[PDB]
Symmetry: D3
Subunit: 142 residues, 6 copies
């Protein structure tokens, strides 16, 4: 298994973000997915967005302190104002064993809505929008 999507975010899992068991807190993972997913939505929307839904999330494997943590995004659908993005969280072992090992720890499907200054719905610009163009192209492949 390999990642699908573009790289949204990349970071190191730190001790401050652990839970009682010593693994990384699920809340931190959700936040990383949220932040990452939103970057890609803002890119496509050419501006501000809000998250309106997360229809699914699956916590597959735990994350450990010291793991490199990447979030990949695949835009599934673009509406007049909405953007639906699948996010996968992947880890790479760089200083724990087995080194170089990579695997998918978490997934989710987020929905964002393009908004104005007042948080109110706005139409995603369709003209001269390369970021949208790229997404629509990958969607049209299935």
């Amino acid at each position: 298994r390999q990642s699908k999507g573009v790289l949204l975010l990349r970071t190191l899992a730190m001790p401050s973000d652990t839970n009682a068991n010593g693994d990384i807190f699920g809340g931190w993972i959700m936040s990383q997915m949220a932040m990452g997913g939103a970057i890609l939505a803002k890119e496509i929307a050419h501006g501000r967005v809000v998250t309106v839904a997360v229809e699914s999330m699956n916590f597959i494997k735990p994350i450990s302190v010291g793991d490199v943590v990447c979030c990949y995004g695949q835009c599934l659908k673009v509406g007049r104002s909405s953007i639906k993005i699948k996010v996968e969280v992947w880890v790479k072992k760089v200083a724990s064993e087995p080194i170089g090992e990579r695997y998918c720890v978490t997934d989710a499907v987020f929905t964002f809505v393009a908004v104005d200054n007042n948080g109110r719905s706005r139409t995603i610009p369709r003209e001269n929008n390369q970021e949208l163009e790229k997404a629509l192209a990958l969607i049209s492949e299935q």
Copy 2:
């Protein structure tokens, strides 16, 4: 809306660029509160395995009181499904006393042992489970 899981104040450190509370913080509160109820029903450790139907309805503002409420929807051998609702109360901003649901979701937890292997939720001596099943029976 079920039982009170968590309660706290919305703080400036947890804001987003728009200046509302960051959605990541909200999801983290829902997870923590839901897990507390799951652990109560399970009579010990749980892991979070899934979320479905998370809806962000309204923004949270700095200074809002934030409560998370939980209603257990199903209990399996090891799995617990809990609807978590996030509610805000205006105590020191207008309009004073106003309360409303801002976010909801359904979390699934699995009862686990010390090795992180699933364990059976005890049917014996478990009034937490008895309460959750009676509430489910009322729906």
Copy 3:
């Protein structure tokens, strides 16, 4: 667990001290935040936190404990409110399970204020929050 529930959360690793227990500062912060919510409720708006008295650190909090702050109002003045805050722990995923006890307490004083930070009178009319407060006072 005496008085009304102000706050409830889980104790986390990031809030530990060098001994591995929960840092005293975090517990003080939870108390002040919970105490202030009830003061704001009672005051029907803004307050300021002006004093603390008789804070007692009884037992340590452990990572993974459920942490609850309870509030017992002791006095309501024109603008001042004194609240006893008790911090309680519940063991839900550590032994012994279902065990609860009081780990910290303190008395906070708040003052109801207007938008320009001047003191204001806590309304006695249509104030169910105060009514419930004065019932708490009914223990000395």
Copy 4:
């Protein structure tokens, strides 16, 4: 003015992340600084671990603003066999905010610590060649 009394315990800058809804620094942050500073002097006097057991008094006098320099000063008031009572004052200095140069006391508190062993049980503060204790008692004497 009034001038600070005691020895410098802590010095830091008040930061945006530690603000309340009014935009001032949160009271819990100030309490935390006072406890940490107080505890350092207690440990210095006690020659090792202590635990905090009481705060008999705390007064929030004035607010702290983002970008204030914040200092905690400590005065040991009393030393028992294992206990140490310490008055903490919090002072601010304006360096990049108006009016520049102004200093004043914003917060005080009186803390009680107890010297403990590795197991968290009471221990006797060593008196023989304890130069930090000697220094504290000499100040208490006058």
Copy 5:
């Protein structure tokens, strides 16, 4: 100017990481650089590392809340235990004007040392081969 090195880290600049000027705190920027550079160092070292030196750091342009922040790294020299990495910090504007704008905001040169889990030499390891190749190129 275009980015040099491989992508180390990518994040969003958040309000909690602001300074008293209202820009993003230099402390946070340095922390990103250290984290990102160490990742590449550990990749080449095939394990744990410590930071021993930062010989240079230059803060070129401020970072703003809501900016996308990327750290890129280029290994300059690999020794027996030592790894030297130039880090560049770049920002991309995605929901502030000018939208689409990218530019370099910070750079630094970090030195790392390969250590075991107490307190070693680098295996000769296709990370090292990619790094040494680029070095031989420049």
Copy 6:
């Protein structure tokens, strides 16, 4: 010798790295904050960090260490301020008790700026913080 005390705090577990020591990013953060305070005092206002040279990590910091930053201004320009920052620890609750040593140092450059982030001239008039710093530089 050390210079003046910029900052003093306790190393906390929230600031640890994956090795269990204090994270180097936190140390760099303390140094930048403490050095900026001195720079701000001399500059009679706001500053920004523009450069670091010769940063050396000497020993690790441990949870529960007392951490102090000390500063010595080396040079003042029209708007720039060069400050050597040393980070020291003191053991107060871990062995060996009372031990103190330098764990990090660096040379920081700050630039005096206005409210729009543009460099400004450090005033020579009525500035005794500058006078103080140039006094020590005079000594070499």
